[PDB]
Scaffold this active site. Sequence first.
Site, PDB file in Angstrom:
ATOM      1  N   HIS A 188     134.963  61.457 -71.219  1.00 46.99           N
ATOM      2  CA  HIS A 188     135.171  62.670 -70.493  1.00 46.99           C
ATOM      3  C   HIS A 188     135.275  62.555 -68.985  1.00 46.99           C
ATOM      4  O   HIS A 188     136.256  62.558 -68.398  1.00 46.99           O
ATOM      5  CB  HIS A 188     133.925  63.586 -70.619  1.00 46.99           C
ATOM      6  CG  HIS A 188     133.988  64.996 -70.162  1.00 46.99           C
ATOM      7  ND1 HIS A 188     132.976  65.541 -69.703  1.00 46.99           N
ATOM      8  CD2 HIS A 188     135.122  65.933 -70.363  1.00 46.99           C
ATOM      9  CE1 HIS A 188     133.274  67.106 -69.428  1.00 46.99           C
ATOM     10  NE2 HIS A 188     134.624  67.096 -69.955  1.00 46.99           N
ATOM     11  N   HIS A 199     127.673  65.210 -69.621  1.00 41.48           N
ATOM     12  CA  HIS A 199     127.923  66.568 -70.156  1.00 41.48           C
ATOM     13  C   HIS A 199     127.324  66.127 -71.529  1.00 41.48           C
ATOM     14  O   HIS A 199     127.819  67.295 -72.316  1.00 41.48           O
ATOM     15  CB  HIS A 199     129.220  67.147 -69.866  1.00 41.48           C
ATOM     16  CG  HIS A 199     129.541  66.902 -68.404  1.00 41.48           C
ATOM     17  ND1 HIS A 199     130.244  66.330 -68.013  1.00 41.48           N
ATOM     18  CD2 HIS A 199     129.025  68.040 -67.396  1.00 41.48           C
ATOM     19  CE1 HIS A 199     130.260  66.282 -66.695  1.00 41.48           C
ATOM     20  NE2 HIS A 199     129.657  67.337 -66.184  1.00 41.48           N
TER      21      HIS A 199
HETATM   22  S1  FES Z   1     131.180  62.457 -68.154  1.00 41.48           S
HETATM   23 FE1  FES Z   1     130.509  62.210 -70.135  1.00 41.48          FE
HETATM   24  S2  FES Z   1     130.021  63.896 -71.140  1.00 41.48           S
HETATM   25 FE2  FES Z   1     131.120  64.390 -69.311  1.00 41.48          FE
END
Ligand code: FES
Lengths: 824, 135, 134, 118, 118
Positions: B64, B83
């Site tokens: 992500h 997140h």
């Molecule tokens: S940076 Fe890993 S879930 Fe968003």
Amino acid sequence: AANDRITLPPANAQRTNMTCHFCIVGCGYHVYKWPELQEGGRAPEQNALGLDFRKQLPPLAVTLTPAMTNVVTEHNGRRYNIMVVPDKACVVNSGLSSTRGGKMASYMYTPTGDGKQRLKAPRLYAADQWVDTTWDHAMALYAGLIKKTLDKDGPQGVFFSCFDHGGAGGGFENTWGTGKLMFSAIQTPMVRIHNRPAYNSECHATREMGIGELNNAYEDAQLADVIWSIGNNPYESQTNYFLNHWLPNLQGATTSKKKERFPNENFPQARIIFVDPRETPSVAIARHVAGNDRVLHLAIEPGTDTALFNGLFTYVVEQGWIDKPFIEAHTKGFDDAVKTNRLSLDECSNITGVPVDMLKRAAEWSYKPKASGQAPRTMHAYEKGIIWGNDNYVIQSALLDLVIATHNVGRRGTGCVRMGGHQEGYTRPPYPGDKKIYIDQELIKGKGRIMTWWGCNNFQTSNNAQALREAILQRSAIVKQAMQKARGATTEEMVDVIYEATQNGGLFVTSINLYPTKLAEAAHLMLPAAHPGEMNLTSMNGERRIRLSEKFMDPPGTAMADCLIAARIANALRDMYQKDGKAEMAAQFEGFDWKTEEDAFNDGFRRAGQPGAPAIDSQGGSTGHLVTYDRLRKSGNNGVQLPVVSWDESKGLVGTEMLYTEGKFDTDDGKAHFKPAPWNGLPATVQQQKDKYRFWLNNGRNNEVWQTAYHDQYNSLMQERYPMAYIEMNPDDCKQLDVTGGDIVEVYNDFGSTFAMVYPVAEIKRGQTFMLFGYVNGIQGDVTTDWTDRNIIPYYKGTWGDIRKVGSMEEFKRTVSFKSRRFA
Amino acid sequence: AGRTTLQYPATQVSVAKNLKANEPVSFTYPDTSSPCVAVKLGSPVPGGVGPNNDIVAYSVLCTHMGFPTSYDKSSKTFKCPGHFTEFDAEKAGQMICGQATENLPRVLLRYDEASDALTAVGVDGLIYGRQANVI
Amino acid sequence: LRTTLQYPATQVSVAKNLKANEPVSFTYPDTSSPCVAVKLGSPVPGGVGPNNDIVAYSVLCTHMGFPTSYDKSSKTFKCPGHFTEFDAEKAGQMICGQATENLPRVLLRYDEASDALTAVGVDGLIYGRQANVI
Amino acid sequence: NDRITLPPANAQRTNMTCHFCIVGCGYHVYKWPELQEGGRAPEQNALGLDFRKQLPPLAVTLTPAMTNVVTEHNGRRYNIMVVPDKACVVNSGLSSTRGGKMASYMYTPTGDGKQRLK
Amino acid sequence: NDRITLPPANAQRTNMTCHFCIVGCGYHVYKWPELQEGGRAPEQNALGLDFRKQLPPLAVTLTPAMTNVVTEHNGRRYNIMVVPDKACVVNSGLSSTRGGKMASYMYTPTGDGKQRLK
Ligand code: FES
Ligand SMILES: Nc1nc2c(c(=O)[nH]1)N[C@H]1C(S)=C(S)[C@@H](COP(=O)(O)OP(=O)(O)OC[C@H]3O[C@@H](n4cnc5c(=O)[nH]c(N)nc54)[C@H](O)[C@@H]3O)O[C@H]1N2
Ligand SMILES: Nc1nc2c(c(=O)[nH]1)N[C@H]1C(S)=C(S)[C@@H](COP(=O)(O)OP(=O)(O)OC[C@H]3O[C@@H](n4cnc5c(=O)[nH]c(N)nc54)[C@H](O)[C@@H]3O)O[C@H]1N2
Ligand code: F3S
Ligand code: F3S
Ligand code: F3S
Ligand code: FES
Ligand SMILES: [Mo+4]
Ligand code: NA
Ligand SMILES: [O]
């Protein structure tokens, strides 16, 4: 091919603005477009991202995967790299992308990619086979039928189920175009909405009480002492509002801003309350972030929301944790609501199953004055757990009574708001009937000549969906059978053949879509539509922030903007009437001389409330004319919050942060109106299911899956993860049924039978379950009842059924994770 | 000119028999800015290497927005604190729940029976925050 | 009791709508008090917004109250009455003129979260008023 | 004169040891924007004292000499209030006449510090 | 700051020629006890100006620099306001920046005149 690299956008790459296609949050993105054989350099000033790819980037530097890239082939045959990435300077998301938004690039149309089965031309089921047809043949048949039905039956023979929403497959251009066609031109009352089976609102009670459902800013979630999430799984359903606004509050990042706004007010650590029978990912993640001591999960019995709110309202009144000056100056009906809604905490606890200590704690956190004297700033956020709950109208009545009495509307850090589903983008003529009509029941009972599904798929998403599919497939069959005796018929003869079939129980079915979908099992005609980026589109998010999503690429084949499909239909009808010498009937189809989507924006949104305009219901209001595409372009992904208050060249669009800050509500007298909220138990139809069968068949969203999986069905990652709709079950229930992860079960009751893969979930309560809704493999809605509230709002979250093992799917066991989706 | 593939290094991680079941080993691949884990799962999985076909290896940067994920021994998952994305070490980095749009990248290991050596020789998937896996 | 004036909080615009050296007009703290906000294009002490460069003023001359005009080429406010000129880059400092008070500054809150500029106070006394809040 | 601007409940508070004598009495410096103020209710001001009615002896040390308005390098004006710490072990909330004037002897362009070398 | 104490209707009014340049512009000096003030209604203040609403251009010359509080030999405190005379033929109510400062340059113990030889 090539899993291990990405083509960077050149420094001079084209960059347009795009609002996320999907959820209400309306996160801002940029689309980079550039010739396939060019690329950016790794040096930050030699690529359009301005990021340094000569060494590893730190965390939070970027959101960029191969799923966020594609190569499109335009109408000229030329190939262009695209990159669809979140905007770091958009206020909504601050550079966050959800897993759903993040796939936009992949879900743009290309000939070889996930969008390869896009509808590119009119499709006709010519009695016994799918074939292509021309746009003119399609219009001659479709307009021809509509005209025939108007001439013989009147508008009551012409049926629609249509989007009313914003974003992709909605928005101000599109809702206007469809609404003008359905209501001003055809003038049919036989219209339902994409998510509900009549022409109604999710928010009748709150509106009638004077409080439109999108009455705050996202900044309000930053300023709140307490957030309530009622029938709402916001980590999964409104991700970046939860991540970018709620969580920073829970972490203490917004405390200094609260104090700067209110220098003489205590701001304790923020807390969150969930009203949800189920322990969701949102509950878990709130606990992880804030601690168990700052989260209250009010794990109510299904359908007992009204009891909950009546018990809290009773309690805050008895303690005096209300705003008596606010009630006196700005409300009507309080004293009556105290009488009708009275419920003791003991009665409340027996009905809800929530212990009295938890009820008192929720009231203490939320309504008891702070040390400094001011009431807590408590934002009450609700969604489908109560909108599709046990009597939509009554629950909102109960909840709003609590909110109004505690002055949790109109103060910053407050609001009683929808979280929202889709984006919003409504501009339409008024509904032309005087009655709510349960459209699916009408169809099941054999009414209507022609039914159009437009940008929705009620095979997957109706309540009582199995009754619907049964009836529609059989009625579609009658038309199919009648069509296949024809040989060499003109279009006009075919119109007569089909019309005759509909006098013998048949129904001509049209779908206006991106894709075939399951509607292709019944449809006789399918028209290709265009989504954002293939067209310009305007819409607003959950804080009424209107943005322009810019066209940057061509649609597949002859796919068109839905507003332009509506114009095409209107113009065909006008021409037929003119030819038939029927000047008055032709005149009803005037006003669709539209060459581009912008024209629909000018005719609808920008005319609302203007001199010489007809009656128009618009979320832009009467200052909508101040918005133009050019002005929205200049605004960026930040847009403006509606309603617009002013414009000039030097200031830009200036709008409205929060509604009701001076205590004037949307009612006759300017006051908010309390309402009675009777507790009558579950509906008899639902209670009958609960009395006969073992499991509560809760249902709703998965984070990764969008809606009916119209794109997701073509995504190999998504299908590897969720090859079938899953049903969360208690492990002990599982052991009793000899099931484990990756077994298939039948789920069934009196209303229907459907199928799911077993997902053991420790947090699910015994005798409760949770099934993914709306899916392409195992449709949940087959087991939902026909029951609706007074305004024909379904209790989609209100059904019970039994479960039977089909057997073990070894391939699901080999390839699907059944690990916990509640983070700890 | 010509080449369609990245020039991955061959980097020794350990001998397979030194790994204990469900005890992650840390290493960098394909350079010192790319943290990775190899773990013996203790039970065979598709594409596992070593004597019991059960050793897997991943880039630990969240796909992500790039936070280093942490291996949870009790679930055999990698969990991201940013997140709340979680990846399945037993299903080739499949995302259990999260905001990523790519599976956790797999470090491809050669296992030589002759020496018992595990060598990192490639990556399947794109490591976060990189134009190419090889910088 | 209270020692301070009760200033209203008035939305002006979002910062990113302001173009460098293009004045925006607004009234604060009521409709008889004309004001200007301008993005100067270069940080100045006490400027707000992303580039710390947005400033705002009462435009009534503190001499005898004529509306001053913003000159884009000098970034000053000039009074046609008796030729006072104030520096928009030095917090209303009188460059030359007959006033005994700098041009009053409208105090703006800048909220990063929303990009809003809100007028929240005035530093200085506006012409022809017993208090800034009437 | 005849009134004082109270520190708002959320006023910034730093620690200051008296500038002057050996004893090193403890003080708090309250700083807030010039156009804000605290309420008289004890929970609506930073001192936590009830100014809705006369205070009893020993409840506070507070005079106008213990207050000022500073002008910072950004041109912005801030109320300051420099008062003894009741919980400091050295002084237990006592201020001498010398330390009590610290607010007055902070630099401001128009006050007692006006001739400061700049 | 952001307000002014108006002269009461019955405030003492004397004549004063500007201290400084040749022009000899005419001013009025309003003097009144510190704890009194004029009302905003034009007949309730000495200026005869309507401070219930914004004044038009040329209606007044009045800033805080044109006001002060003097401490007399008897220890009593008095507001002063030094403003141009509208009916003086010389200046017709005009004040230069230099004469406009007269009130500020009157002697007070804490103001601009604080270092007056005493
Ligand atoms: S940076 Fe890993 S879930 Fe968003
Ligand atoms: N990932 C993803 N996000 C989406 C969507 C998507 O398909 N996928 N769809 C969008 C759309 S159109 C919508 S409408 C929103 C919906 O978003 P939500 O309403 O947030 O999502 P749901 O899963 O439908 O329902 C929320 C909760 O209602 C609970 N619930 C069930 N019965 C009751 C009850 O009687 N009372 C209460 N109080 N709660 C109950 C369920 O346990 C569930 O966790 O999501 C939007 N966002
Ligand atoms: N049991 C149960 N049932 C539910 C719910 C639930 O919680 N439980 N949720 C309800 C809710 S809140 C909703 S929003 C509804 C959703 O019900 P639907 O509206 O029926 O399903 P969606 O997937 O939003 O439908 C969008 C469709 O339009 C197409 N589409 C996408 N873009 C375009 C476009 O640009 N133009 C056109 N013409 N078509 C386009 C897609 O391919 C897809 O077929 O389902 C409801 N059904
Ligand atoms: S990326 Fe899209 S899916 Fe919602 S959370 Fe943001 S609008
Ligand atoms: S002068 Fe000495 S007695 Fe205390 S207040 Fe100051 S340390
Ligand atoms: S300086 Fe001269 S211009 Fe008039 S106010 Fe004084 S006599
Ligand atoms: S009125 Fe402005 S210089 Fe005199
Ligand atoms: Mo919805
Ligand atoms: Na045929
Ligand atoms: O919805």
